[PDB]
């Protein structure tokens, strides 16, 4: 009854030529989805490189200040004064450097690690044009499509 | 959209053609699980190889750092207690420790800068972890359906 009904409907609509049609539709759907994803990846790359420049610059400045302080201490500890008078100054300068580093680290503030990093960068910078969520769901859908295409090509 | 409703009808038809509804379906699920796992194995091979080749490097680097620090320790102790006195070797040890710390931080910042530069350059010029991940998730859902079907 109803089984023969859906069998006749199968012969009617499900022409059964949909195997090669499905192959060509999938090998085009994949290109379509990648073409959709591309701008999101460009936005992500731009944001992450801009947030990497800053980190590099700040770490270089930190190393420079460290070396300048070392220089001053060495010169005083061997040329202008004796070590006796420059022991408490050395200890208290190291204490002040530690306090300054902590004040800086307080005023600033395995794939799952990268996902957390991207989510944190997006939450902090919060710039339109890039939504981490839509990017993730699109990445996973295109992955599943690549996978299906591999199974189909065999 | 017509192709979509056609695919719905095809799903319905594959459902209706079933004989021994729960048995042959359990069999088909077993074949699907086996196929997905046989496909999953190469990705796991790639992942374990990459993990080991990235772990041994850090292990050897940390051993080298510890060895260098121990050598400095021994040198300073021998110069302090045998050749000279601590009165004359206080600023030398303090500044040697300062230099070692500054060199460690410089190595860290340099490897960080080199890594980020190389990564950004490779990304701009260009083991797909996400198909491995969706593969794990799909095979887990399938094993779960098999369990629920068992009892």
């Amino acid at each position: 009854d109803v089984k023969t009904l859906v069998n006749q409907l199968y012969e009617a609509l499900n022409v059964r030529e949909h195997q090669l049609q499905k192959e060509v539709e999938l090998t085009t759907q994949l290109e379509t989805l990648q073409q959709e994803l591309l701008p999101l990846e460009e936005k992500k790359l731009e944001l992450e490189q801009v947030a990497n420049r800053r980190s590099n610059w700040m770490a270089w400045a930190g190393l420079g200040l460290m070396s300048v302080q070392f220089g001053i201490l060495a010169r005083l500890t061997w040329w202008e004064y004796s070590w006796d008078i420059m022991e408490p100054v050395t200890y208290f300068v190291t204490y002040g450097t530690a306090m300054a580093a902590y004040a800086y680290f307080v005023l600033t503030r395995n794939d799952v690690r990268d996902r957390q990093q991207l989510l944190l960068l997006h939450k902090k910078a919060k710039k339109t044009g890039f939504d981490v969520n839509q990017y993730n769901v699109l990445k996973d859908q295109i992955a599943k499509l690549e996978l299906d295409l591999k199974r189909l090509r065999d | 959209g017509l192709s979509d409703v056609k695919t719905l009808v095809n799903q319905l038809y594959e459902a209706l053609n079933v004989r021994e509804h729960q048995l042959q379906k359990e069999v088909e699920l077993t074949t699907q699980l086996e196929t997905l796992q046989q496909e999953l194995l190469p990705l796991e091979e790639k992942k374990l190889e990459l993990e080991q080749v990235a772990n041994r490097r850090s292990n050897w680097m940390a051993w080298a750092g510890l060895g260098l620090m121990s050598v400095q320790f021994g040198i300073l102790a021998r110069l302090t207690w045998w050749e000279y006195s601590w009165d004359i070797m206080e600023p030398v040890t303090y500044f040697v420790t300062y230099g070692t710390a500054m060199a460690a931080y410089a190595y860290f910042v340099l490897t960080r800068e080199e890594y980020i530069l190389n990564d950004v350059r490779d990304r701009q010029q260009l083991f797909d972890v996400n198909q491995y991940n969706v593969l794990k998730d799909q095979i887990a859902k399938l094993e779960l359906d098999l369990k629920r079907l068992r009892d």
Partner: peptide, 25 residues
């Protein structure tokens, strides 16, 4: 190369700055 070019000038600048500051004081 960049490591030395960053450290050594900073150290020399620190030495000269301590010299000048001590003279001023």
């Amino acid at each position: 190369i960049r490591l030395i070019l960053t450290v050594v000038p900073g150290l020399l600048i620190g030495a000269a700055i301590s010299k000048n500051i001590a003279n001023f004081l």
